[PDB]
Ligand binder design. Sequence first.
Ligand SMILES: Cc1ncc(COP(=O)(O)O)c(CN[C@@H](C(=O)O)[C@H](O)C(=O)O)c1O
Ligand SMILES: Cc1ncc(COP(=O)(O)O)c(CN[C@@H](C(=O)O)[C@H](O)C(=O)O)c1O
Ligand SMILES: [Mg+2]
Ligand SMILES: [Mg+2]
Ligand SMILES: [Mg+2]
Ligand SMILES: [Mg+2]
Ligand SMILES: [Mg+2]
Lengths: 379, 389
Amino acid sequence: QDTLLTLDTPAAVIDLDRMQRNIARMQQRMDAQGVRLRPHVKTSKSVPVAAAQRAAGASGITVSTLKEAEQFFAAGTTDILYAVSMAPHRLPQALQLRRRGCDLKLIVDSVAAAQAIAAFGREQGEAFEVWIEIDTDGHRSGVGADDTPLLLAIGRTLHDGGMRLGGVLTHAGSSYELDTPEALQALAERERAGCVQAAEALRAAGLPCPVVSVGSTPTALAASRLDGVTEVRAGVYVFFDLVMRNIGVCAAEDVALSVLATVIGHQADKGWAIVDAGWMAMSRDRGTARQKQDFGYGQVCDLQGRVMPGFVLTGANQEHGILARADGAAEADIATRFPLGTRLRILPNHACATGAQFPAYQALAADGSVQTWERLHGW
Amino acid sequence: HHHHHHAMSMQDTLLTLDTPAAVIDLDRMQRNIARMQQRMDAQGVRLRPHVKTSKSVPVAAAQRAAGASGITVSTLKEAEQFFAAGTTDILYAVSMAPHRLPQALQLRRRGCDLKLIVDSVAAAQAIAAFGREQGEAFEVWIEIDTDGHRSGVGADDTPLLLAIGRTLHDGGMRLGGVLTHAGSSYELDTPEALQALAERERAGCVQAAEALRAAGLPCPVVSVGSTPTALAASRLDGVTEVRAGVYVFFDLVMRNIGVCAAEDVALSVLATVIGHQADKGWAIVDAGWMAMSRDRGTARQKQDFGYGQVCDLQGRVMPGFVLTGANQEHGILARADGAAEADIATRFPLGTRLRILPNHACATGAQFPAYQALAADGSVQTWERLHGW
Ligand SMILES: Cc1ncc(COP(=O)(O)O)c(CN[C@@H](C(=O)O)[C@H](O)C(=O)O)c1O
Ligand SMILES: Cc1ncc(COP(=O)(O)O)c(CN[C@@H](C(=O)O)[C@H](O)C(=O)O)c1O
Ligand SMILES: [Mg+2]
Ligand SMILES: [Mg+2]
Ligand SMILES: [Mg+2]
Ligand SMILES: [Mg+2]
Ligand SMILES: [Mg+2]
């Protein structure tokens, strides 16, 4: 059997017991709120990870690219939301997916994008399902939640244009700037209220709006109530990461994704251990640098997964990571503690960024064996 | 003409590719290749390009055709790929892990002249014991710390150099040389500081080789390099080869260091405008950090380019517009100066294609399964590159 001692390094390891606990926690919270969970698979892009989310009770998926829609559809998943403002040039790709049987949903936030979809759908005989993206927190895309004229103009373009106006959605991504339950709870309420208000405005205009979809992992876990909401979209929670830990929604011990690395040398005067997990393994994401505890390029754990507080990757080049004390001191006799060849596991800043560096995950079972779970790269 | 007509009908250009896409401007890439090879020829040293920037067979083929001698790789997966493609002279320039010794042995047994590096007595002892067990005289170079960038034996640490060189030589391995990488050059931004660092890198690696040879140990190769010190060195006496890699494409970190212009940057990411926030002066593009990478190396340099410098479809810089933010599949295009551009939707209409110059070519390239190699006629060809280990 393949195990953490036999793998080459670096490797992206999923602790299956931790991932299942994360999947159960999120599904149980959504069940308590009376809403569907539509996981965002862009975090893993791996068929077996999404299958475990579905087995726990998830309803459909959210994807960040049409490549992910192709992969998951080829795997038998048909209820797919492509939650990135639709580019008109990708309409042939989307059409071919729907004609093949994939119930692929698109989103827009502009009259011009809604007109491009509706005109192509009429030409091709396709009533595209399209949701309107709502900006509830100023994070990124979307129709402002009280910009009613814009909301109604896009709504009538789709519905009068013969398309299926399927719903409204929002992602309150500014939740990643927060770090207290009170602030997260308030942002989750602003997200819920803004999305519900857009749905209510459509409906008062006699336009259909059957789905109201909100979510980010921190607002999904913090929201006190979700009246008016039909589903929540959350993705990074499947593994968690150190950014989530700093936001306050999980502990380091809950993070299910780590990078297995080998010690390949040392700088004794500086108290460095050099590992073979550089930024090509961890990614360049440094999201914890802007937070109350900086973890460098990741938190060190031993081969058993025990967190080693106070050792982090303080630097990284492409294929070399620099392990050193978080307090800045030069650990004495670093080589005596971490001899050449010692294996360690590094928890990521951002699970979605680190996962994308690997062709595959190594799914670690209770007995210590691993199975390789491929994931998708590119577009 | 059946093949001809069908190929024409299938041929992509920058208007027909899906976005995002990593586009190599071949004419800029050839100018970078010629420039570095001519500089190394002028210095009388070999150029051993570091292929970890592209990990692409046709890009390394163009470096070889121009005059390069061998390659440097950052992983044994690169050594496996490039050897399969016919490159036999390969330096694996990352401190050797003992557990990878079976793979290095297999590659040498298949005919790859694969060189390994160490910087410790324990790594030397592991290589020599495995080589004696397996009947293999591994070739091993000793890595030298000349500028404090990362790791390596100190150039002035004679006792440790000798201990490692003797462990290898007495152990029946081939002690083949010393190498250094003065990566602290990426913190510099004047020709004077770069020329002085290049001289410190040359002097320190030659110093180490001279200490080994003074002890009777072989050390025929002296290998130095980073792209900025390769381009800045006045003299390379005592050096046998230079390793450089990011030069093949350049990037905005190199532009800021001062060793190229933005117009020399051969790699760009083709993106489409997919939305706006008109009141904030934002255009939203489909190149987020999954396309650009999270690399922000320009953040602390003289000119911060955010997640990349915006260029028009013809690849010309659009001054003052950069990607100021990025989420996974969304980039935020806005003024670098922090003004909200008026009429952003007029400046950048929905569906507009743009090209984004990267902070760090090695980091952006690794986000793509393949490059789109752009010829002067506007045609592109898919050039696969390696992902993972
Ligand atoms: C449109 C949309 N919906 C849901 C999610 C899931 O959010 P998480 O559960 O918090 O992962 C996202 C996530 N988007 C990413 C991104 O990079 O775009 C986050 O904003 C982030 O990691 O910063 C989403 O876009
Ligand atoms: C051992 C070794 N040799 C040569 C090079 C090539 O340097 P460039 O020509 O400047 O790319 C490198 C490069 N190493 C990278 C890295 O990430 O490790 C650079 O230090 C960097 O991009 O920061 C090298 O490691
Ligand atoms: Mg975000
Ligand atoms: Mg994320
Ligand atoms: Mg460096
Ligand atoms: Mg580089
Ligand atoms: Mg392998």
